Amino acid sequence: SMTVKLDFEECLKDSPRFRASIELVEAEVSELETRLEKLLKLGTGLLESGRHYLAASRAFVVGICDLARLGPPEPMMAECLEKFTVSLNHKLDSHAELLDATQHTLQQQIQTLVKEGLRGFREARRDFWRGAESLEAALTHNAEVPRRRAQEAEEAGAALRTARAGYRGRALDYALQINVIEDKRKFDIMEFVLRLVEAQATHFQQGHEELSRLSQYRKELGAQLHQLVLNSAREKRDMEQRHVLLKQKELGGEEPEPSLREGPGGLVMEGHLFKRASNAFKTWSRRWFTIQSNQLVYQKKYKDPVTVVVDDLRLCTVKLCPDSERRFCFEVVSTSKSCLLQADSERLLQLWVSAVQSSIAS
Amino acid sequence: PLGSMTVKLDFEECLKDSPRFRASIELVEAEVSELETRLEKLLKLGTGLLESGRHYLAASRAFVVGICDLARLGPPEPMMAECLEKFTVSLNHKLDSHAELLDATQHTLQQQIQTLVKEGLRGFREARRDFWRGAESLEAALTHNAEVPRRRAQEAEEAGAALRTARAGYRGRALDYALQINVIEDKRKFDIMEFVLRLVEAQATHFQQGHEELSRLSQYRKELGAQLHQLVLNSAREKRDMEQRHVLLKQKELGGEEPEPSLREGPGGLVMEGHLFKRASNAFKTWSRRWFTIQSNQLVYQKKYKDPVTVVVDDLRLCTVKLCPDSERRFCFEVVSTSKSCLLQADSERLLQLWVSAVQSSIASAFS
């Protein structure tokens, strides 16, 4: 609305316009301080959330390596993490440098401006208003002194003289400080924004050149992956076809037939049998039995401690049970102990019994 | 090809329905379940990344809004406006490209990782259920078989045939399962690699978009950097000129003199202006200092720069001026017109004599 008029002419004149000019400058510096401090506040916001973001990204790339760590070592997957994961980390480190550079201009341009950069202004402002107060006292005093008996008048004029000389110096100093911060405001803001831009450019250039050096590896991997996905789909089709022929022609539902094998340490055979418990419930249950080293043992699951049902199989005999309720029953009879077993078929029965018959041979 | 979740699966052990076969199925299930866990942990890490990223972009946008805020202050300058215009758009651009980057990152999390853990594992989970349903049916067919009575040759017939179909089903389902275990072994490697490839592509777009825009800005940056270093030199040169001047003003000039009212400007001839004390004119008793102007055939005064001018002498042709070396205050003089009278007081002897002959000269002049 108004033009500031703060040249030595208007200063020495001490006009209402000079006064209004000082008030205007004081208004626009006060908003300068408020708007620099808020930008520092927003600068803290940007930096604190930037660092959190980069920490999360860092933790994300680690998650990726943890994921791929599963399964066997696969050279192609490992070369892929080796190149890309160092590459994703590099962008995060370069981003961190960007936030550092951002912090640095905030301190170097903006923060010093509201602090040390405005000190001369605040001082001269202070000394000027101090001078305006004492001049306004000297003018009225020199005015209200009657003549009718006066030498305090003589001393009022000399006092007015020193208040004018003083006020004039302070108005000039203050005007000079105002011109200086006018220029400093301009260059410090423009250099501030130019440094933010130059730090973006360093960041985008480092990133873009590292990604560009991978351009070749990236296309070759894409070509590879797409071909592998196709080979896999074909291989899955083959398997599924084989499985159909297997189930329609070759599998069937015959009970497995444990083979009598000559192990190291005697005849070995393993296979499922039903067995009767020795407690009073006499519950029949299915177990995995093993004939090995002249012992008959069973387990429920793999790596279970064996229960030894027969101590020494060369102290026993084997018989059918024509006097039990369920089919395919047989008994292994030791000295004091006895054990009841059952096979799933007549075939399985005979196979097991001559297997035990044989493991009785010494 | 190579085995790995398939390395342990043994078709002979499956046909024997052996405990080692059962164990090898349980180990694959532990591996897939750990695969699910790590996939799930990755999604959650992705959420943390995305939510953090968005909050960071938002804080950044507000930082850029703050920069403009700051720069709109003060007397406007086209160099500053050009500066703020090019750069705030360019900084905002980087945030948009970055927002695009977070979008893409989320898109590949969804299509590769989240789709793997939900739908990608569906075949595995269905074949697993069918395999264990097969196991249970076998198991019931075996006990049922084992329990059929001595001379029930008919029920023996039926239990046997139910067992046979239960066994073949069991083996069929183990194969379907084996199949799905291979499939999942392949998805695992291809989908994670494709995922990481796509994060990289998304980075390259972002970095290429940011880099290109900033290079187009490159001569302007180097030119602005030049102009800026220039302005800071000028400003040092001018500041030295002003200190030189002020040292001259303090030294060369005043003994402490009041400003002498100044003559200036051509609005209706020349103008004269300066401070005077004025008694307010009805026995009020108030010596009030105001800024008087002789202007356009009038003597006028103001308190403030803004203040509408209040007229003291409507027409200088119709007024008189007279010294008052007889009054109670030093350096007084009076201005009378048809309607107004005004007692006026200067600050010194010399100003008194400046303002009165000034008025007389204004009076004589305006008859021209």
Swiss-Prot record, chain A:
Where it sits in the cell: the answer is: Recycling endosome membrane
Instruction: List every stretch annotated Required for formation of endosomal tubules when overexpressed with PIP5K1C.
Output: 2-362
So what does mutating S30A actually do?
No effect on interaction with ITGB1
In the record, the effect of F281E is given as: Almost abolishes membrane binding
Write out the tissue specificity statement of the associated record. Answer: Highest level in lung and spleen. Low level in heart, kidney, liver and pancreas.
Q: What is the effect of changing S15A?
A: No effect on interaction with ITGB1
Q: Where is the BAR domain?
A: 2-227
Consequence of changing F281A: Reduced membrane binding and ability to induce liposome tubulation
Q: What is the effect of changing F281W?
A: Preserves membrane binding and ability to tubulate liposomes
Q: Which residues cross the membrane?
A: none
- Outline the extent of the PH domain: 266-361
Domain free text? PH domain binds phospholipids including phosphatidic acid, phosphatidylinositol 3-phosphate, phosphatidylinositol 3,5-bisphosphate (PIP2) and phosphatidylinositol 3,4,5-trisphosphate (PIP3). May mediate ACAP1-binding to PIP2 or PIP3 containing membranes. Only one PH domain of one ACAP1 dimer inserts into the membrane, while the other PH domain acts primaryly to interact with adjacent ACAP1 dimers.
Describe its function.
Answer: GTPase-activating protein (GAP) for ADP ribosylation factor 6 (ARF6) required for clathrin-dependent export of proteins from recycling endosomes to trans-Golgi network and cell surface. Required for regulated export of ITGB1 from recycling endosomes to the cell surface and ITGB1-dependent cell migration.
Q: What else is known?
A: Cells overexpressing ACAP1 show an accumulation of ITGB1 in recycling endosomes and inhibition of stimulation-dependent cell migration. Cells with reduced levels of ACAP1 or AKT1 and AKT2 show inhibition of stimulation-dependent cell migration. Cells overexpressing ACAP1 and PIP5K1C show formation of tubular structures derived from endosomal membranes.
Subunit info? Banana-shaped homodimer laterally assembling into tetramers, the tetramers further pack helically onto the membrane. Interacts with GTP-bound ARF6. Interacts with third cytoplasmic loop of SLC2A4/GLUT4. Interacts with CLTC. Interacts with GULP1. Forms a complex with GDP-bound ARF6 and GULP1. Interacts with ITGB1; required for ITGB1 recycling.
* UniProt protein name: Arf-GAP with coiled-coil, ANK repeat and PH domain-containing protein 1
Q: Which organism is it from?
A: Homo sapiens
Give the stretch of the parent protein shown, with its full length: 1 to 361 of 740
From Swiss-Prot, chain B:
Task: Cite the PH domain residue spans from the record.
Answer: 269-364
**Coiled-coil stretches:** none
Query: What does the UniProt keyword field contain?
Result: ANK repeat, Endosome, GTPase activation, Membrane, Metal-binding, Nitration, Phosphoprotein, Protein transport, Repeat, Transport, Zinc, Zinc-finger
> Residue ranges of the BAR domain?
5-230
UniProt main location, coarse: membrane
Additional comment: Cells overexpressing ACAP1 show an accumulation of ITGB1 in recycling endosomes and inhibition of stimulation-dependent cell migration. Cells with reduced levels of ACAP1 or AKT1 and AKT2 show inhibition of stimulation-dependent cell migration. Cells overexpressing ACAP1 and PIP5K1C show formation of tubular structures derived from endosomal membranes.
Q: What is this protein called?
A: Arf-GAP with coiled-coil, ANK repeat and PH domain-containing protein 1
At the highest ranks, the source species' classification is: Eukaryota, Metazoa, Chordata, Craniata, Vertebrata
Q: Which gene encodes it?
A: ACAP1
